[PDB]
Amino acid sequence: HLSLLYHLTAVSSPAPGTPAFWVSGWLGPQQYLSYNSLRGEAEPCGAWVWENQVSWYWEKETTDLRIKEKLFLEAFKALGGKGPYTLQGLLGCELGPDNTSVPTAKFALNGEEFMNFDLKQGTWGGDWPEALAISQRWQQQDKAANKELTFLLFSCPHRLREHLERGRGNLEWKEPPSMRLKARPSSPGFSVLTCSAFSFYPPELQLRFLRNGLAAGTGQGDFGPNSDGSFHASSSLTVKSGDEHHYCCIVQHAGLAQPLRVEL
Amino acid sequence: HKSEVAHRFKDLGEENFKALVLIAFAQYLQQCPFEDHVKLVNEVTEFAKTCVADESAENCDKSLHTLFGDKLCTVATLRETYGEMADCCAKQEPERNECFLQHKDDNPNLPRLVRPEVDVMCTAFHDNEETFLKKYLYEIARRHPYFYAPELLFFAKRYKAAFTECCQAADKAACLLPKLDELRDEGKASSAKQRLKCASLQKFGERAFKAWAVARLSQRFPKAEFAEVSKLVTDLTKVHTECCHGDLLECADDRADLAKYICENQDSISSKLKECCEKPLLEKSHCIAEVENDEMPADLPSLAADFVESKDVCKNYAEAKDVFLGMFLYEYARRHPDYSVVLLLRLAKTYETTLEKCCAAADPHECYAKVFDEFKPLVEEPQNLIKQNCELFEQLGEYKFQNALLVRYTKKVPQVSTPTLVEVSRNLGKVGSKCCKHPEAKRMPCAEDYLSVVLNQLCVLHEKTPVSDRVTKCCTESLVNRRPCFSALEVDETYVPKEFNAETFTFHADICTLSEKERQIKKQTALVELVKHKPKATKEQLKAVMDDFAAFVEKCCKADDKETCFAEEGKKLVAASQAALGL
Amino acid sequence: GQPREPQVYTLPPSRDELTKNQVSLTCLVKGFYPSDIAVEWESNGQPENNYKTTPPVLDSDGSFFLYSKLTVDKSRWQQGNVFSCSVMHEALHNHYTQKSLSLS
Amino acid sequence: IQRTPKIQVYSRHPAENGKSNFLNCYVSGFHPSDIEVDLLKNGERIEKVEHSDLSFSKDWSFYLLYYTEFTPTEKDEYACRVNHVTLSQPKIVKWDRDM
Structure with missing residues (x-):
């Protein structure tokens, strides 16, 4: 079910010492790769430094991303006008049933999707004027179209397979959460219950509230990452003061054989 | 002859033909399954037979490239399964074949060949023999697309000979695996020597x-x-x-x-x-x-006669640069089987440079009288390097040696990726095993010949994915001066060091499943990475932080609840290492 | 409501008009929904100032239509310089199209 | 085309006074990418704040993890301070112990 996805970003006038362009590469919700226009080199992130990886893998990455850098910084020439720009791209692929890849290639300008890459016609598309401009600049190039094709239909899925084999260790990692449930006097005759999940991987996880064994739904959920690739979650609920000890909190998660009841 | 396909088939005979064609396709289409190639080969053969029959028949006039081309574009998928290869079917001869040639070994990185069990192999060999051998050809050819076709045929005969000689034995493994393993080792070296030959030419x-x-x-x-x-x-x-x-x-x-x-x-x-x-x-x-x-002739006169003392030097150089200089290499070469070719070419280079400059001079003889002095330093430097390197290889392990090189090269060329650096070192390091055995006289030449092959491998692959300016330079500048270029290289102070963080040493407990061979590669990785964190790190600091590392690993695998350790100690090894390095 | 692709045609200055020093390069834009729509001129890769554009009016069919009267000097038009009436609208393929007008 | 940040502050491990931990601040869902995020100990900024790579989500909005090692004490008060084009003035979020 997992997927290789690159998060390309360029800006037209960067705060100085900031990079004009940069990429983050992801395997599922793990960041494996990292690149930017200053350093100019694709580097492994996190536990992926220790991946049993082959020679030339990384400089293949670098080579590809440099073509991307050029393309992206080229886009702002095509747009012409003054006002600062932010060009984003989401590129990748996901494995499908029959030893089959499914590609993704969308882009956004100043925070709105506007352009895409049609893998059938081998053309960029989108119909905003901005997208027509950029689409045109790229389509008339040293076979930029072909390289995007190879990158998505060949390189991407070949990489994805390679990482699955050589990086099971990371991908299949499992860490169940530490749980805490607490009561916080809030209002007049009210109080806030907060269930919290600490340090878990993978990030799929649900929090639920019971009140004497019957569902009180969920309230506001919150979800986030820790420094170490693990995750954090919390859910909160309004509740009659003095009626607190009646509630508990239940948690579902891949790293637990069965759902956990969490007392106050 | 009207038909080239006909000519070859006649000359080479059928069995060699079918083999060479199978190699041809293997080398171009490295992932097309075996069965497919056999169909293609058999089609091309059967077509050929109809020209051996009638040389004026339909299509037999066509060139080999058109025919093999036409056929390779039968498989249109190419893109989905090979990539920028498909772009070539677009083109027409002769540009088409040049294309196919560039797009060999974009993918070295193909699945490894796990050997079946000795008995299952001897089963298959006794059963469909003719095939078993074809599979050898296909498997080897496709992982070495520059492999010297005619030699591969010979390797194929050796393979067969081994199975002919060993499958009747009670202990088949004892008999066979030694023979197959020498044959594999000869093979990997041959492929490499040939890749240098083609790089040289191309x-x-x-x-x-x-x-x-x-x-x-x-x-x-x-x-x-x-x-x-x-x-x-x-x-x-x-x-x-x-x-x-x-x-x-x-x-x-x-x-x-x-x-x-x-x-x-x-x-x-x-x-x-x-x-x-x-x-x-x-x-x-x-x-x-x-x-x-x-054995060399009796009493060959001094090289000075013809190339310094003779007053016809500049005349002849003017009359036939390439011939004259050839005479020089020939004369020098035959006097010195001990020296390596690489070295002799450097010497010829200096000679030529010298004549070029000196014949222009007012008094050319005066100018070049002492040309032989120029060769002294060109000879010493390699001798000194190999001498120091073999002392280092004895004084340290094959393992501990590689680590020494790994650190050395990482400092010169840190822009190159860690896995690439690990591998390159492992190979350079093999110059200990191969050459330092030999006696004094014979070391340098074994070394330089082998090094030159290893470096060319680096250069050929680096050219497709350039990452270091320094590598580009040394690989490009002079073929004959690569090795010294690399050796000359100083610590790269342009590199901006990797920084530390808590997560820098992130390991899940999967590392304790690891073999030794496996866990040593990992140590080597950590070593390379440390250098990248501080390139001017002294051997002292480095071994310090590296001991800390091994302390860490041993410790955590040997605890109840493994991943508490990693999680908990992972940042402390970092803290430790910043201190032990400066920051 | 169902928006409709606009349809842009240029029209050159009429016989009668050419006599004088100035000309009126017309841009009719009809067959569009809705009202909202941007119209400009541009010549020689470069925008034009000297022009006006009527607001829309509702065409019997239900869609709207518009005109634009770019004036230029006669000499310029004669020299052949290509003029290009540009339109922007919701249902325009790529939200934009431009047409051209020149001596013929 | 212009989005305001969402600021979560939470510890990595359950908070226990005197035991070592990490404090995270997770700024998310903002556009454009320029953002100043400072972690505050008792109203003044910490200098050993590390932070993750600037990235973006399925919905194109940017996000970022700032984090520091720390050992909480009962007395100490922490907070996360974010400035961004879309904010009148620095927004400060107090680290609720419970969440």
């Missing part, structure tokens, strides 16, 4: 290869007259030019003829050829490629 020109060949042959055949060494060098050039451009059928033929020419004229070439020339077609050429140097 990227550096005919002149460059011819120079190499003259130096090399003159070492092996020191009694042969210059006139004879030339004809050989020319013949050798045609042969290699041909298998490097993918014309396997033509080059196999021409090689056969060369072996035949050599044997017919043994007396004017070498006394050490008697044994070799009494052998079957395929072992003839191998023997001759592999044989011992002839």
Whole structure:
């Protein structure tokens, strides 16, 4: 079910010492790769430094991303006008049933999707004027179209397979959460219950509230990452003061054989 | 002859033909399953038979490239399963074949060959033999797309010989695996020597290869007259030019003829050829490629006579640069089988530079009288390097040696990726195993020959994915001066060091499943990474932080609840290491 | 409501008009929904100032239509310089199209 | 085309006074990418704040993890301070112990 996805970003006038362009590469919700226009080199992130990886893998990455850098910084020439720009791209692929890849290639300008890459016609598309401009600049190039094709239909899925084999260790990692449930006097005759999940991987996880064994739904959920690739979650609920000890909190998660009841 | 397909088929015979064609397709289409290639080969063969029959029949006039081309574009998927290869089917001959040639070994990185169990192999061999051997050819060819086609045929005969000689034994493993393992080792070295030969030809020109060949042959055949060494060098050039451009059928033929020419004229070439020339077609050429140097003539006059004292030096240099200099390599070469070719070419380079500059001078003789002095430093430097390197290899392990090199090269070339650096070191390091065994006299040349091959491998792959400016320079500047260029390289102070964080040493408990071979590669990785964190790190600090590392690993695998340790100690090893490095 | 692709045609200055020093390069834009729509001129890769554009009016069919009267000097038009009436609208393929007008 | 940040502050491990931990601040869902995020100990900024790579989500909005090692004490008060084009003035979020 997992997927290789690159998060390309360029800006037209960067705060100085900031990079004009940069990429983050992801395997599922793990960041494996990292690149930017200053350093100019694709580097492994996190536990992926220790991946049993082959020679030339990384400089293949670098080579590809440099073509991307050029393309992206080229886009702002095509747009012409003054006002600062932010060009984003989401590129990748996901494995499908029959030893089959499914590609993704969308882009956004100043925070709105506007352009895409049609893998059938081998053309960029989108119909905003901005997208027509950029689409045109790229389509008339040293076979930029072909390289995007190879990158998505060949390189991407070949990489994805390679990482699955050589990086099971990371991908299949499992860490169940530490749980805490607490009561916080809030209002007049009210109080806030907060269930919290600490340090878990993978990030799929649900929090639920019971009140004497019957569902009180969920309230506001919150979800986030820790420094170490693990995750954090919390859910909160309004509740009659003095009626607190009646509630508990239940948690579902891949790293637990069965759902956990969490007392106050 | 009207038909080239016809000619070759006749000359090479059917079985060789089918083999060479199968290699051809394997080398171009490295992932097309085996069965498919066999259909393609069998189609192309059967077409050929109809031209051996009637040379004027439909399509037999076409060139080999058109035919093999036409056929490779049968598989249109190419893109989905190979990539920028498909772009080539777009084009027309001759641009088309040049395309196919660039797009070999974009993917070295193909699944490894796990050997089946000795008995299952001997099953398969006894059963469908004809195939089993074809699979060998296909598997090897596709992982080494520059492999010297005609030699691969010979390797294939050796493979068969081993199974013929061993599957009747009670203990088959004891018999066979040694033979297959030597055969695999010979193979990996051969592929490499050949890749240098093709790089030389393609990227550096005919002149460059011819120079190499003259130096090399003159070492092996020191009694042969210059006139004879030339004809050989020319013949050798045609042969290699041909298998490097993918014309396997033509080059196999021409090689056969060369072996035949050599044997017919043994007396004017070498006394050490008697044994070799009494052998079957395929072992003839191998023997001759592999044989011992002839003993050098009695009382050869000083190189000074013709190349310094003679007052015709500049005249001849003007009248025939390439011939004259060839005479120089020939004369120097035959006097010095001990020296490596690489070194001799550097010497010839200096000589030429010298003449170029000196003949322009007011008094040319005066100018070049002391030219032989210039060679002293060019000789010492390699001797000194190999001498120091073999002391280091004895004084330390094969393992501990590699680590020394790994650190050395990482400091020169940190822009290159960690896995690439690990591997390159492992290979460079193998120069200890291979050469330092040999005695004093014979070390440098073994070393330089082998190093030159290893470096060219780096360069050929680096060219497709350039990442370090320094590598580009050394790989490009001079073929003959690569090794010294790299050795000369200082600590790269332009590199902006990797920084630390808590997560820098992130390991899940999967590391304790690891073998030793496996866990050593990992240590080597951590080592490379440390250097990248601080390139001016001294051996002291480095081994300190590296001991801390191994302390860490041993510790955490040996605890109840493994991943508490990693999680908890992972940041402390970092803290430790910043201190132990400065920051 | 169902928006409709606009349809842009240029029209050159009429016989009668050419006599004088100035000309009126017309841009009719009809067959569009809705009202909202941007119209500009541009010549020689470069925008034009000297022009006006009527607001829309509702065409019997239900869609709207518009005109634009770019004036230029006669000499310029004669020299052949290509003029290009540009339109922007919701249902325009790529939200934009431009047409051209020149001596013929 | 212009989005305001969402600021979560939470510890990595359950908070226990005197035991070592990490404090995270997770700024998310903002556009454009320029953002100043400072972690505050008792109203003044910490200098050993590390932070993850600037990235974006399925919905194109940017996000970022700032984090520091720390050992909480009962007395100490922490907070996360974010400035961004879309904010009148620095927004300060107090680290609720419970969440």
